[PDB]
Amino acid sequence: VKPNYALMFTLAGHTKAVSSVKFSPNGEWLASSSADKLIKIWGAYDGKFEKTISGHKLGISDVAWSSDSNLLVSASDDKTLKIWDVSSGKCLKTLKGHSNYVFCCNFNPQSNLIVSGSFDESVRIWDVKTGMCLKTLPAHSDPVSAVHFNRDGSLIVSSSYDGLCRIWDTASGQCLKTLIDDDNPPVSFVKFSPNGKYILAATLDNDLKLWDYSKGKCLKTYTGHKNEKYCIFANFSVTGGKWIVSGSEDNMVYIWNLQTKEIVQKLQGHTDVVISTACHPTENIIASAALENDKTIKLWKSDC
């Protein structure tokens, strides 16, 4: 098996490089954030523009959905994160505390908490209801590239340019594990596997790795793409065959066989670094977005 993703649509609208694309949990929406300071909502199946949500003062590096597809959180260079009511498009709260760019964000499964990572080298945990910061973790010694809750919310994983990936206990904020990748190259992205037993990390040495964090063992490696400059999102595609999906600095989307580590398909079309990709929660659909010379978003569909 090799998926056969083909272009569905090209979503244009952003005036600057797109930074992140995410599918809502119920699967009917695609939310995008851009260096143009805007967030746009699109129809996941028709690729139809739905609305623009604005408010941030500077570019936005990331956006995440709440478990009920009703809320959206964004991380911006203006040093804040913003919680948005998706249907009205208005800003419910502005999370303040970070002393530099906020680079990444995510709701926990319960969606009562928000975790953020910033260039200030800290990871903060916020209360969604009040917009207050509950904890500030002295997580790394360099910018934090990614933050992610595991499936039960008890854990948080963070990656950093300091070359480390750390597992944190959500309730206490204490570090449970620090992982080293021998040469310790900058970690540009990390995320738990759907079942929560693994961690997929991207390092700026053109390499992706699946780790059993508990054992500190590398089970698989995915290479062949180009990644030594930007923090490119990576995904687990489990709707059909089990694949590993990721953007690449050579303008293509890479799809690997998760078990054999074999490249099963490269999607062509974008005209600049594919900085972000997302996998639809129920259908074999992929959303990809590129930088400045492209600024478009593409929806791909496969029989898988």
């Binding site: 930074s19 851009s34 680079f103 400059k229 900085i275 400045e292």
Partner: peptide, 5 residues
Amino acid sequence: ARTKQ
């Protein structure tokens, strides 16, 4: 700013 290196 993820869009910048």
